[PDB]
């Protein structure tokens, strides 16, 4: 027989298996591919590991408390320090890569909840004080949750990024975010969500350290609710796999 729910994604040397999953969302309808020569601008021969970098990386799990507003991961920054994808990112100047985001959160039949797994391109965010911009390590997080905060962030002489969940830190309606490729994790039916994101930047290639093209935001629209006696620590673990990595401009390591 056949079943729509089951799905198995294999990449590099690490594959994932989801018994209950909703159909994969293929970005804007464009599966990621290597830079065609009709639009190349770097004359150097690009290195393409294609196995070393194109593999499923599992980031750090985060707890989904009934009081958890949301989380955001800058995809390039998140993998900056993990494996060769991180090493080659540190060395090469230019970097072009598609993404295969996959967020797992499994709960029993008696739990309830709903996540919005959406990857936002160019998530330029706003600082608590209007005049200054947020600093790195506040806006960015290395394998870190970078959690949203429901309360509006107090505005003083600081560089704290607005974590206001009802604005998503971009001063836009969180409900209207759906426009970006998005998959919901309704605990009652699907415990996993996968979005294949194409490389979405205005230039053929960009330095990954200089700029983060896409940011995975998990915003629980319906809070987790369970009766006493059920497991109280249900985590959300994110496994992001790069695809079609292409790097130019070999230089000394650093940034």
């Amino acid at each position: 027989g056949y079943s729509d729910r089951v799905r198995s994604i294999t990449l590099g040397n690490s594959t994932i298996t989801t018994q209950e999953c909703a159909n994969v969302v293929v970005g804007y309808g464009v599966w990621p591919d290597y830079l065609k020569d009709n639009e190349a601008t770097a004359e150097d021969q690009p290195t393409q590991p294609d196995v070393a970098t194109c593999r499923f990386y599992t980031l750090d799990s985060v707890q989904w408390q009934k009081t958890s507003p949301g989380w955001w991961w800058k995809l390039p920054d998140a993998l900056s320090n993990l494996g060769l994808f991180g090493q080659n990112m540190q060395y090469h100047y230019l970097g072009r890569t598609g993404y295969t985001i996959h967020v797992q959160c499994n709960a029993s039949k008696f739990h309830q909840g709903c996540l919005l797994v959406v990857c936002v391109p160019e998530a330029e965010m706003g600082c608590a004080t209007l005049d200054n911009t947020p600093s790195s390590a506040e806006l960015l997080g290395g394998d870190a949750a970078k959690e949203f905060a429901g309360e509006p962030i107090a505005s003083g002489s600081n560089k704290l990024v607005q974590r206001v969940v009802y604005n998503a830190g971009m001063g836009i309606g969180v409900g209207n975010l759906t426009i970006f490729p998005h998959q919901w994790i309704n605990l009652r039916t699907n415990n996993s969500a996968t979005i294949v994101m194409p490389y979405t930047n205005s230039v053929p290639m960009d330095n990954m350290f200089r700029h983060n093209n896409v940011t995975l935001m998990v915003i629980p629209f319906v809070p987790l609710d369970y009766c006493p006696g059920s497991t109280t620590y249900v985590p959300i673990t994110v496994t992001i796999a790069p695809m079609n990595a292409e790097y130019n401009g070999l230089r000394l390591a650093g940034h």
Binding site: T129, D131, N132, T133, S135, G156, S157, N158, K159
Partner: protein, 105 residues
């Protein structure tokens, strides 16, 4: 252009206070660099590649550029007493940016 334009630097009395005014210039900016520091009135001036004490009685000989046109205009005020808002106004003809620093103690 100036990094972190609103800042609140609190420092105890007796040690030098480092007040940063690091700035980045746009391609459109091709003008004489005029850096002026104000307190709440003019502490220091930088025009024509020279530094001016400006005869400020409260801060004479205690204020100097830590670094310059490279992009740094920070000041290390020494031997604080000085409490007020320090405004650094790097100047370019297309855009002039200013940074306000509140100093405590």
């Amino acid at each position: 252009s100036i990094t972190t334009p609103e800042e609140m630097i609190e420092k105890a009395k007796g040690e030098t206070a480092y007040l940063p005014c690091k700035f980045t210039l746009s391609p459109e900016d091709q003008g004489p660099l005029d850096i002026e520091w104000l307190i709440s009135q003019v502490i220091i001036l930088y025009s024509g590649d020279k530094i001016y004490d400006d005869y400020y009685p409260d801060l004479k000989g205690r204020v100097h550029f830590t670094s310059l046109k490279s992009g740094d205009a920070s000041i290390n005020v020494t031997n604080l007493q000085d409490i007020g808002t320090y405004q650094c106004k790097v100047k370019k003809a297309p855009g002039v940016a200013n940074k306000k620093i509140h100093l405590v103690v």
